[PDB]
Amino acid sequence: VPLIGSLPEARLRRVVGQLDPQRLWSTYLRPLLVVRTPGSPGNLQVRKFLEATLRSLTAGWHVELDPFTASTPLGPVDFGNVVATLDPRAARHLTLACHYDSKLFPPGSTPFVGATDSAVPCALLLELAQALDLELSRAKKQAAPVTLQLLFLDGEEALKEWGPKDSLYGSRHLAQLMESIPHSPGPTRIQAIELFMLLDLLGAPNPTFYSHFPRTVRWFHRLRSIEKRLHRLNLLQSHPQEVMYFQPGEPFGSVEDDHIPFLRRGVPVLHLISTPFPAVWHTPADTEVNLHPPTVHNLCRILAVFLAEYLGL
Ligand SMILES: CC(=O)NCCc1c[nH]cn1
Ligand SMILES: [Zn+2]
């Protein structure tokens, strides 16, 4: 439905048409589907891949690492968050986030590559940035006062499921770091985050999302509206009912994740995580062949419209 603040149909269809499903799958997702536990060569290689892909965008993003070493159940480990801010001068930003590490499992099993968890989230952010690159470049050249920020967090997963401090390494570090860095008007980089939208556990068939935070329910309702509209406009696949993903009511459950260090510091959060979790969750079957590609692209389309409406692209 065409609500105030929504895209006119023509601008909606242009935006959706700038997505490239083969690019998402082959250019952004496939290279991530490797073991990428914190400290590993695979993790370093995925980090460098994210950085170089983000630097390649013609919009000219500010891309930096947040490297640090932390104590873990395995001893000291190095972590590195990838922080991409389209216009570092802007007063505030929409922040989209996900984790790029994969969960460590014991040797001797099929390697875990976390296709839903969170390779698909990562690839979605890269595809949105590329598909909207011209518009984002124009917004930045016009000094828009709300920019876009993408966070690819390291170390979300426990290394040994060794208690509550064996988790969220990257997000805990980056939230503390942002609290310590001045920003204008700020007064710190935490207050620059106008909304923190965390994507997690995406790409399985039949996801269900609930609003986890009354504070941000208006954005949850916008996602739901976009799902219904794309359905009606014949722009979703394998989507027989008008609303399938964005469900009303209390969450099936809520869970700790990379938004918590930000939430605790007063950042508004929308947690875009399937609850219940994918069937494959935390098993080595969380792989490419068990993703549901029409759902991946449906989510990409929903998010692209969301982003364009949020930032007036
Ligand atoms: C309580 C809990 O397991 N939260 C973490 C959810 C998760 C796992 N893997 C990715 N995200
Ligand atoms: Zn996980």
* Complete DSSP assignment for 77-100: EEEEEEEEES-TTSSEEEEEEEE-
Residue 46 Cα distances to 42, 197, 245, 299, 301, angstroms? 6, 22, 29, 23, 25
Task: Find the helix or strand (DSSP H, E) in which 273 lies.
Answer: strand 269-273
Rounded CA separation 173/66 (Å): 9
For residues 198 and 254, is the Cβ–Cβ distance under 8 A?
A: no
Q: Is 20 a catalytic residue?
A: no
Which residues on adjacent β-strands are paired with residue 85? Answer: 62, 149
Q: Residue 171 contacts by C-beta under 8 Å, 6 or more apart in sequence?
A: 81, 97, 99, 153, 156, 258, 259, 260, 261, 262
Tokens of 3: 């609500």
Question: Ramachandran region of residue 192, left (φ > 0), alpha (ψ -120 to 50) or beta?
Answer: alpha
Residue 159 C-beta-side C-alpha neighbours within 13 Å:
20
76 SS3 class:
strand
Query: Residue 41 is part of a domain; what is its CATH number?
Result: 3.40.630.10
The one-letter code for the residue type at 256 is E
Distance 110 CA to ligand 2 centre (A): 16
Atom 9 of ligand 1, residue of closest alpha carbon: 117
Whether residue 2 has a cis bond before it, omega within 30° of 0: no
DSSP helix, strand, coil percent of the chain (3-state; round to 5): 40, 20, 45
Are 313 and 129 spatial neighbours (Cβ–Cβ below 8 Å)? Answer: no
C-alpha to C-alpha distance for 204 and 115, rounded to whole angstroms: 9
How far is the C-alpha of 164 from the C-alpha of 166, rounded, in Å?
5
Q: Residue 118 and residue 107: Cα distance in Å, rounded? A: 21
What is the β-pairing status of strands 146-153 and 75-85? antiparallel
For this entry, resolution in Å reads: 1.1
Distance CA 99, CA 199 (A): 8
Cβ atoms 37, 43 nearer than 8 A = yes
Ligand 1 atom 10 nearest Cα: 117
Sheet strand arrangement including 146-153: 62-72, 75-85, 146-153, 92-99, 193-200, 269-273
Q: What does the block give as tokens for 107?
A: 């040797």
Q: Which domain, by its residues, includes 197?
A: 1-313
Q: Quote the Cα angle for 263-266-271, to 5°.
A: 35
Residue of 154, 161, 168, 257 best suited for mutating to test ligand 1, as the one with most atoms within 8 Å of CB: 257
Say which of 200, 227, 257, 286 is annotated catalytic: 200
Contact (Cβ atoms closer than 8 angstroms) between residue 151 and residue 95: yes
Mutate to test the pocket of ligand 1, among 113, 171, 198, 200 (most ligand atoms within 8 A of CB): 200
Closest ligand 1 atom to Cα of 99: 10
- CB atoms closer than 10 angstroms to residue 283: 14
Cα 183 to chain center, whole Å? 23
In three-state secondary structure terms, 192 is: helix
Q: According to the entry, how was the structure determined?
A: X-ray
In degrees and rounded to multiples of 5, residue 96 shows phi and psi of -105, 135
CA of 171 to the centre of ligand 2 (A): 14
Cis before 251 (ω within 30): no
CB 202 within 8 A of CB 118: yes
Q: How many structural domains does the chain have?
A: 1
Of 101, 154, 156, 257, which one is the catalytic site residue?
156
Helix residue ranges per DSSP H, the chain: 9-17, 21-22, 41-56, 120-131, 133-141, 169-179, 217-232, 260-263, 293-311
d(CA 129, CA 307): 10
- What amino acid is encoded at 238 in this protein? S
Q: Which two tokens stand for residue 162?
A: 């060794």
Give residues whose Cβ lies within 5 Å of ion ligand 2.
Answer: 117
For residue 182, list its beta bridge partners. 188
Q: Is 99 exposed, middle or buried (0-12, 13-18, 19+ CB in 10 A)?
A: buried
The number of residues making up the chain comes to 313
Residue 150 tokens, joined: 């993408």
Pocket of ligand 1, beta carbon within 6 A? 117, 200-201, 255-257
Environment class of 124 (CB within 10 Å of its CB; exposed 0-12, middle 13-18, buried 19+):
buried
Catalytic residue status for 200: yes
